[PDB]
């Protein structure tokens, strides 16, 4: 149940809460206090999603949907069959995510590595809380959050996007999309480059980081370096999530019209607004 090198790393300590009360492993998983919390919240959320499937009347996993309370309920509680289950599952999900991050903190402390992984997960948790907690609270209703269904939260995304015309024109959305695309491109390039260095042409020696830098300089004239590429990947993903959270937190709170109407400000600058010709003239 242990890797060939895991034995020397399984030592007491690093726990945030509980000392040695939960300082143990179940199979490969390290439990800890926050692991106990994460498992409880996850099991409760999954069982409540199954129960909401029972209440809804469908067992098809793609049709299972846990809708938030309707806008009539505001930010208060709702009956479980009509929005309260969504609130409980949201609380369970937030608890599970935060417990997962803190369990990762405990594992980082035990292994003596930096806290970059829980810190990066905190960004995803913040984007989730923007979608389910911060934005609905700012707008004043839990019905502005998305349902917990495989294809119904896509309906939420579609309706929220088309509320503001074409959502492509949200500028923070544009920045987040560019970050996402660049992150996917950089991940493809990085995986491919490391694999090409480590799996060269058959019968040839394994390559070195010098070969990787030479390849990318001969390709695009610049090489960011191994440390550089890993920093870039982390920053691209985190910036994408940060700007998506920003785009959703400004939408419906400080912006209410179509976003192309936002883009009209550049067109109507005084020195070229009235010039005929072009597209907006």
């Amino acid at each position: 149940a242990l890797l060939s090198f895991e034995r020397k790393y399984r030592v007491p300590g690093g726990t945030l809460v509980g000392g040695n009360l939960f300082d143990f492993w179940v199979g490969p998983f390290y439990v800890g206090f926050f692991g106990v919390a994460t498992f409880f919240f996850a099991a409760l959320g999954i069982i409540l999603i199954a129960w909401s499937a029972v209440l809804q009347g469908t067992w098809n996993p793609q049709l299972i949907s846990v809708y938030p309370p309707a806008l009539e309920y505001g930010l208060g509680g709702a009956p479980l069959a009509k929005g309260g289950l969504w609130q409980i599952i949201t609380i369970c999900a937030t608890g599970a995510f935060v417990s997962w991050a803190l369990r990762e903190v405990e594992i980082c402390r035990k292994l003596g590595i930096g806290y970059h992984i829980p810190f990066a997960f905190a960004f995803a948790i913040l984007a989730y809380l923007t979608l389910v907690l911060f934005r609905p609270v700012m707008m004043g209703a839990w019905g502005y959050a998305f349902p917990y269904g495989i294809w119904t939260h896509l309906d939420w995304v579609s309706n929220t996007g088309y509320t503001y015309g074409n959502f492509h024109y949200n500028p923070a959305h544009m920045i987040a999309i560019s970050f996402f695309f660049t992150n996917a491109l950089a991940l493809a390039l990085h995986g491919a480059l490391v694999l090409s260095a480590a799996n060269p042409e058959k019968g040839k020696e394994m390559r070195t980081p010098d070969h990787e830098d030479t390849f990318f300089r001969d390709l695009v004239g610049y090489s960011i370096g191994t440390l550089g590429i890993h920093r870039l990947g982390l920053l691209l993903s985190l910036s994408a999530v940060f700007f998506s959270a920003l785009c959703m937190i400004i939408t419906g709170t400080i912006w209410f019209d179509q976003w192309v109407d936002w883009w009209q400000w550049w067109v109507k600058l005084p020195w070229w607004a009235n010039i005929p010709g072009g597209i907006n003239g």
């Binding site: 400000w265 550049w266 600058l269 005084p270």
Partner: protein
Amino acid sequence: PEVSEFAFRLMMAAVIFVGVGIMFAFAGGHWFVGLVVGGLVAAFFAATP
């Protein structure tokens, strides 16, 4: 309480950006000029702390 040269420089750059942006947006006919001037000043100040 442990701010270094870069951190304090960036905080002051942000304050200068916001202030100059508001000031020039009020001065100019649009907020674009203020935003651009404030951003450029902040970037120049933070480039060489």
